């Protein structure tokens, strides 16, 4: 199997590009599982995450519970069956939003995640980099820059794309990075 994720602010186009990728790979003959966070593990998490004035720790722990179930019950079984599994959002979303955005310590985030994810990391992550005003502007600037920080740190895994480019051009770039895999 092959694990791929898409990341970015809401309205960055990462959702569009996840489905375009899923359809492209399917046309190459490859079995695909398209999924998303939050809700891919525990659909009821989407309710809890909207709680008024939720602490950043509680918000991250809810994302993590969802992720734990998502990895165990959906993603790992899909990879085991030889599928390309594509998730619209994964752990980097939490690192960018709860870590860089809300100020939680990244090492704690990663330690929680290590059991939650069983260490599962995608082979490639396509980050759609969107100017924060096109998404709490201060918050969104922190999240945007946090994503870029994550990408600088794991340049093997991240492919950073300009989300202001036409949808078709971004899809072609994504396809070009995959062809060799």
The binding site consists of 8-15
Residue 102's binding partner among a second copy, Cl ion, Cs ion, none (Cβ under 5 to 8 angstroms by kind) is none
Among 42, 71, 113, 161, binds Cs ion (CB under 5 A): 113
Q: Report the distance separating Cα 96 and Cα 98, nearest Å.
A: 6
Question: Which of 29, 30, 32, 35 is CA-nearest to residue 15?
Answer: 35
Binding mask 40-79 for a second copy (x = CB under 8 A): -xx-xx-xx--xx-xx-xxxxxx-xxx-xx--xx------
Q: Smallest gap, in angstroms, from Cβ of residue 65 to a second copy?
A: 4
For position 162 contacting a second copy by CB under 8 A, the verdict is no
Among 20, 67, 83, 89, binds Cs ion (CB under 5 A): 67
What separation in angstroms does the CA of 5 have from each of 14, 66, 101, 134? Answer: 9, 16, 20, 22
Neighbours of 121 (CB within 10 A): 14
Asked if residues 12 and 128 have their Cβ atoms less than 8 Å apart, the reply is yes
Residues at the site binding Cl ion, with contacts judged by CB under 5 A: 12, 14-15
Residues at the site binding Cs ion, with contacts judged by CB under 5 A: 13, 64, 67, 113, 116, 118-119, 159
């Amino acid at each position: 199997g092959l694990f791929l994720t898409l990341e970015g602010l809401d309205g960055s186009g990462k959702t569009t590009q996840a489905r375009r990728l899923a359809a492209f790979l399917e046309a190459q003959g490859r079995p695909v599982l398209l999924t998303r966070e939050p809700g891919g593990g525990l659909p009821e998490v989407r309710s809890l995450l909207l709680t008024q004035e939720l602490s950043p720790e509680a918000e991250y722990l809810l994302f993590s519970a969802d992720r734990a179930e998502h990895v165990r019950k959906v993603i790992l079984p899909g990879l085991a069956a030889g599928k390309v599994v594509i998730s619209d959002r994964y752990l980097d979303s939490s690192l960018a939003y709860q870590g860089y955005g809300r100020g939680l310590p990244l090492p704690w985030l990663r330690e929680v995640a290590r059991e939650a994810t069983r260490g599962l990391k995608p082979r490639l992550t396509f980050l759609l980099d969107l100017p924060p005003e096109a998404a709490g502007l201060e918050f969104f600037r922190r999240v945007r820059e946090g994503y870029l920080a994550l990408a600088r740190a794991e340049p093997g895994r991240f492919v950073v794309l300009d989300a202001t480019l036409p949808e078709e051009e971004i899809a072609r770039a994504i396809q070009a990075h995959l062809r060799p895999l």
